[PDB]
UniProtKB/Swiss-Prot annotation:
It comes from Escherichia coli (strain K12). This is Fatty acid oxidation complex subunit alpha. Signal peptide: none annotated. Induction: Unlike the aerobic pathway, the anaerobic pathway is not strongly repressed by FadR regulatory protein. HAMAP family: FadJ. Pfam families: 3HCDH, 3HCDH_N, ECH_1. GO terms for molecular function: 3-hydroxyacyl-CoA dehydrogenase activity; 3-hydroxybutyryl-CoA epimerase activity; enoyl-CoA hydratase activity; long-chain-3-hydroxyacyl-CoA dehydrogenase activity; NAD+ binding. In the N-terminal section; belongs to the enoyl-CoA hydratase/isomerase family. In the central section; belongs to the 3-hydroxyacyl-CoA dehydrogenase family. One of its GO terms (biological process) is fatty acid beta-oxidation. One of its GO terms (cellular component) is fatty acid beta-oxidation multienzyme complex. Residues 294-698 are annotated as: 3-hydroxyacyl-CoA dehydrogenase. The keyword Membrane does not apply. Gene3D superfamilies: 1.10.1040.50, 2-enoyl-CoA Hydratase, Chain A, domain 1, NAD(P)-binding Rossmann-like Domain. Its EC number is 4.2.1.17, 5.1.2.3, 1.1.1.35.
Amino acid sequence: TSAFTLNVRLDNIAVITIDVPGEKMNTLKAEFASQVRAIIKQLRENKELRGVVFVSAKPDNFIAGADINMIGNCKTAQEAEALARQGQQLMAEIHALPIQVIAAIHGACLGGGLELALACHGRVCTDDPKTVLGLPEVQLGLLPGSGGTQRLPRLIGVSTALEMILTGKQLRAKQALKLGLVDDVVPHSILLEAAVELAKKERERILAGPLGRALLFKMVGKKTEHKTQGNYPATERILEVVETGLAQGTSSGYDAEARAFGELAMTPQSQALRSIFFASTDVKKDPGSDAPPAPLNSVGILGGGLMGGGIAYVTACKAGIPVRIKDINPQGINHALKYSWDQLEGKVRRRHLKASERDKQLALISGTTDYRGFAHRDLIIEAVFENLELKQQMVAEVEQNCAAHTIFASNTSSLPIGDIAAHATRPEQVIGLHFFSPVEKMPLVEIIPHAGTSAQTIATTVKLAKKQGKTPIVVRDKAGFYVNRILAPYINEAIRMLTQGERVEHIDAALVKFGFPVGPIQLLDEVGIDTGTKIIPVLEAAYGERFSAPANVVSSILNDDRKGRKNGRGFYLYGQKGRKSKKQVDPAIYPLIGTQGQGRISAPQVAERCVMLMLNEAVRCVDEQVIRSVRDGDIGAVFGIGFPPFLGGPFRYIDSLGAGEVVAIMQRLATQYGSRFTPCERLVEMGARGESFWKTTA
């Protein structure tokens, strides 16, 4: 029956220990409002104090901001705005304290927690890697909504404050001190002792109030519009709330911040963003199997190059597991080792610790061509050539050169795991672990158990996958798995429009405006036309002509040796040296492939044509039990192929669009463009009945 309690010391300086009684992390619950009022009145009552400090007893963190469930318990903009204005009002009483108030921050301090630090006159933080300051409410479709949109700009400057609010990026203590956000960064032992010590103590060219700051907002607004394409409502309201707050006065802006927090909470975009946040922590909590994980003290990598280097990089640096790389090409090992060096040579940029920690993490990386240290490797990730007979040999080599409890994790793209495990002595310890290049950048992995994969090695592989910073999904051993299977018809349809007279500048721009990061064929170029088209024959024989492509388009492109960006040129130029215009848009591609049409199609009709083909294939795998749940399919496509996050995923996009309406669109598309668009066998059933993919349908 308490959360905050304060105890004054011999020197009359109060210390409020923050510790939510039961929960693992300090969150700003609705129950804390009356408590902090009751104690902040006790500070004023005595009038015999010099300073006050704020500390978080939980060693994990400081304050993780307000809980996203409290916003969900509001059915109107007035209620969401109500607790928003109540949030600013309470922290105004903290800033109005005649006593000097300091926040001592050890651990993460994000969202509403960082705002409390802004209300305090001074701040002290630790130099720990787990302490981070940020305002990530924009990532939930919302906005700081408790004083963060005005208190922060007047402390760091609008130019670098707006970055923190529009992206939600968090800063580290050494970088936080430069901006002036924290007044001092001291070790965790000195924190409180120094915090109370400080608590006892009592450019201009762009600073032009009317035009210097006016240029920033015209320039930041144009950038933010281009990056988001206007599909994120909070992005409009952050500039609006912070602009009027600085221009027309703090109090009038505070009231605009509250109204923004209110109607942003009921936006359809924000509720979609908060759901994938809830689904992300659900996946991060789900172990895929109820069996106890096997030990993972040391791992190994089969295969070299940038492919193997990426797996080894995230395995040793991010997960802290020593890894050896086995490759029979001596040159292939150096590229796998050099790639991991250049990653940790990010110490050039002000970050990455130093040679102390650079060589500490690097000492866990090693390479050899001769199988001499593999006798005790608890798990070995295979990343060699995509060939079944070669992968079967790899299985036969790890079982003979390593322990009897090792796990074979194959990074395959189009081969069934049952065929890779067909000739294994212990087929219980072989699994699919599917990464996406570039390995460091992409955050999703597909963990594919075959018919005989043990429930222990299932739980063991995901524990490693989550240790590498990846959000894994467990998908069935069917051809194409999930993320590649729902992307092949998506790319084939964009290519089929090119053969129908469309221009690539129009198509790619049409889908990034729809919500995707990059267009389908720019994606095909970046990932490689070689790799992006090697799975269309596998999915053809496994599921029929539904995954078909135009007759001889891809056959004509790479027979001209146009592999994409990996070599000289592809769908885009990449030979544009001088760089006056960024977008390459190669014009030799149009004559290379037949194109009779002359652009009848519109701008949303293009993006809808292939997203419907993708939605069709998406609900197919949840009906075939390829993905274990509809939640695994949402984050599987949101983090997998950059499905528009403001829509919540492909399955939450159907619920908002209407199961009966989407079946009518594809039946309408099928009449016009062919029978590849016909609704999924299960979607027609959901179009008849009031079926939603998610709870709380209305």
